[PDB]
Design a protein around this ligand. Structure first.
Ligand SMILES: O=C1CCN(c2ccc3cc[nH]c3c2)C(=O)N1
Ligand SMILES: [Zn+2]
Length: 108
């Protein structure tokens, strides 16, 4: 393999994204934010991610990224919750905000 830095689903090993695809939303790819119950999520933003399935309809409620609606993104292979897909925005129109602790960075 290439050894290129990629992110795998911690639960099943599926390749989900690459360090090359980190996206600095608002100036940083990492956003330490909270779900509505006060649990911290260290979210890493990516311009592209693979192997995900979206569930439900997009919502604007509690959106961490002003102007974007979110949808839950699961691993399409094992069903584990890996983060959210954001859409309806300006630049970029869509992106992924993934939970860093749900992924494992490693060599491709
Ligand atoms: O931008 C977003 C992403 C989704 N999100 C969220 C919403 C509800 C729940 C309930 C448990 N974890 C949640 C996370 C949020 O607050 N903002
Ligand atoms: Zn998985």
């Amino acid at each position: 393999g290439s050894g290129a830095s990629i992110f795998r689903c911690r639960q099943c090993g599926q390749t989900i994204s690459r360090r090359d695809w980190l996206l600095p939303m608002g100036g940083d790819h990492e956003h330490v934010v909270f779900n509505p119950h006060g649990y911290i999520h260290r979210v890493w933003c990516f311009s592209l991610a693979q192997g995900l399935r979206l569930i439900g309809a997009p919502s604007g409620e509690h959106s961490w990224f002003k102007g974007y609606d979110w949808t839950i993104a699961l691993c399409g292979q094992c069903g584990s919750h890996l983060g959210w897909h954001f859409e309806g925005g300006s630049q970029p129109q869509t992106f992924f905000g993934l939970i860093k602790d749900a992924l494992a960075e490693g060599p491709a």
